[PDB]
From a paper:
Hsp90 is essential in all eukaryotes where it regulates the form and function of diverse client proteins, many of which are key signal transducers. Hsp90 enables drug resistance via multiple molecular mechanisms, most notably through the stabilization of the stress-activated protein phosphatase calcineurin and multiple components of Pkc1 mitogen-activated protein kinase (MAPK) cell wall integrity pathway. Hsp90 also serves as the previously enigmatic thermal sensor that controls temperature-dependent morphogenetic switching in C. albicans, a key factor contributing to the organism’s virulence. To identify potentially exploitable differences in the Hsp90 expressed by a fungal pathogen vs humans, we determined the crystal structure of the C. albicans Hsp90 N-terminal domain, which includes the nucleotide-binding pocket targeted by all Hsp90 inhibitors in clinical development.
We obtained structures for the domain under three conditions: apo (unliganded), in complex with ADP, and in complex with the prototypical inhibitor radicicol. Despite the presence of different ligands, overlay of the three crystal structures showed an almost identical conformation for this domain with a root mean square deviation (r.m.s.d.) of 1.32 Å or less over all atoms. Nonetheless, localized structural differences between the apo and liganded complexes were observed in the loop between α-helices 4 and 5 (residues Gly97 to Thr104), a region on the edge of the ATP binding site. Overall comparison between both human apo structures (open and closed) and the fungal N-terminal domain showed no major differences, with main-chain atom r.m.s.d. of 1.02 and 1.15 Å, respectively. Importantly, however, the region spanning residues Asp91 to Gly97 of C. albicans NBD in its apo state was seen in two conformations. We hypothesized that this observation might result from greater flexibility within the fungal ATP-binding site than was immediately obvious, an increased flexibility that might contribute to observed differences in the intrinsic ATPase activity of the fungal and host homologs.
Numbering used by the authors: 5 to 218
The structure:
């Protein structure tokens, strides 16, 4: 049962600018997505200070980076607060009109793309390196859902009957552009994390797949 919705026009505008830009420091996407993961983790930690049972759906607080080399997919998972079905539609497809408009005006004046997070729309920096995204999310109030976008004017939201259970939190699945496959490599990911994400209150875990040889 796929629900199709329309992006706020300005968000569609910004996605087109980002997916097409030749900006040369694309690695900042990972900084922005780790920062958003950290924010989501802050929110569940805040709720858990009042009500520790909110953590029972996934007791550990983490950010986890999972390259899927054969799929040409980079996954970025957190155990933050998650998004309900109603959220995903709102947080990603509709709200942040203000930040997107302000950021585009800043771009026209000369702003560096790397300041995208100062406008609150750093999520959309993922289109620097990906041409398609799935956002899998699980909030304590709700079932697990998948939100999906190709940087065009529409997105879908579907009950998640095909991905691993998250317990609680959000996983972005970035379908990388053909010239951006360096962000599947352990050494490259580590470099970017260490350079840009030193001040993060949660462990940043890197999942690496190695052949056992003798």
């Amino acid at each position: 049962q796929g629900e199709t919705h329309e992006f706020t026009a300005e968000i569609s505008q910004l996605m087109s600018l980002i997916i097409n830009t030749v900006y040369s420091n694309k690695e900042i996407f990972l900084r922005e997505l780790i920062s958003n993961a950290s924010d989501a983790l802050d929110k569940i930690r805040y709720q858990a200070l009042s009500d520790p049972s909110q953590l029972e759906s996934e007791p550990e607080l983490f950010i986890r980076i999972i390259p899927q080399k054969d799929q040409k997919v980079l996954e970025i998972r957190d155990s933050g607060i998650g998004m309900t079905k109603a959220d995903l539609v709102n947080n990603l497809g509709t709200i942040a009109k203000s930040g997107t408009k302000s950021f585009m005006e800043a771009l026209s004046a000369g702003a560096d793309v790397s300041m995208i997070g100062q406008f609150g729309v750093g999520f959309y920096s993922l289109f620097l390196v990906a041409d398609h995204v799935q956002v899998i999310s699980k909030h304590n109030d709700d079932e697990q859902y998948v939100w999906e976008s190709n940087a065009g004017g529409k997105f879908t939201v579907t009950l998640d009957e095909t991905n691993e259970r998250l317990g609680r939190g959000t996983m972005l699945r970035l379908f990388l552009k053909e010239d951006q496959l360096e962000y599947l490599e352990e050494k490259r990911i580590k470099e970017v994390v260490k350079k840009h994400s030193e001040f993060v209150a949660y462990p940043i875990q890197l999942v690496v797949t190695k052949e056992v040889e003798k």
